Amino acid sequence: PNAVGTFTEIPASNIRRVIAKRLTESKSTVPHAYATADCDLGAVLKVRQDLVKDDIKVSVNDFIIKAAAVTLKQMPDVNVSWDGEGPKQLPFIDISVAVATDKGLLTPIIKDAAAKGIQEIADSVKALSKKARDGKLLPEEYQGGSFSISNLGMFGIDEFTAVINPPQACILAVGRFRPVLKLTEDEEGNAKLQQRQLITVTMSSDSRVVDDELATRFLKSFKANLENPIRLA
Structure with a gap:
């Protein structure tokens, strides 16, 4: 009728229905917590440019991934499995x-990306990229991860808040590049003031499991590991 209008009915797919079920139980149980930090990829983008001499294309999400494995390998406290009661x-x-x-x-x-090289990390993301687009992948290859990493910055949404996927205590949401400004180089110098592109990384974490300082060191030594890959190597 006139007030409520003609709709279209959509059936919610089982795939989506399970997803929504889980996200609901998580929103209820998990006191999600979010953090944000912005890091310098500029010299790292340069690193990318050289690596382009090689015949596998590599992206920045690969760096974010390897840096997450390096940070969690350094701080496993951030990487844990919450089942019911106790952290795992x-x-x-x-x-x-x-x-x-x-x-x-x-x-x-x-699987085990912590021990995998960068080249194999890129070729791996590409393999799972094919396997995921042709729909080959089985459920378990979508399951069991110790954590998640996602970038919406290859689209937009400068800042974003995601929903943690249980039984995982963290997920990484990455944004765009901002002309963030480092100062005049020389303390006595002319050198006028300079914006540079700085990538954004949003840490989603459960207040219960993750400790405020725990996440703070996660994204902190995360920005530090990104402030040079030699710390990532």
Whole structure:
């Protein structure tokens, strides 16, 4: 009728219905907490430019991933499995990459990426990228990761808040590049004031499991590890 209008009915797919069910129980149980930090990829983008001499294309999400494995390998306290009661500390680094498709967001799990090289990390993200787009992947390769990493910065949404996917205590949401300003170089110098592109990384964390200082060191030594890859190597 006139007030309420003609709609279209959409059936919620089982895939989406399970997703919504889980996200609901998580929103209820998990006191989600979010953090934000902005780091310098400029010299790292340069690193990318050289690596482009090689015949595998590598992206920045690969750096964010390897840096998450390096930070969690340094701080495993951030990487834990919450089941019911107790935190489950996993020395094993399982990375869940969020890829956008027409079917919705696929979460291919990278097994043991902590011990894998950069080249193999890129070729791996590409492999799971194919396997995820042709729909080959089985459920378990979408499952069991120790944490998740997602970048919406290859689209927009300068800042974003995500919903943690249980039983995982953290997810990384990455944004765009901002002309953030480092000062005049020389303390006595002319050198006028200079914006540089700085990538954004948003840390989602459960207040219960994750400790404020725990996440603070996670994104902190995360920005530090990114302030040079030699710290990532």
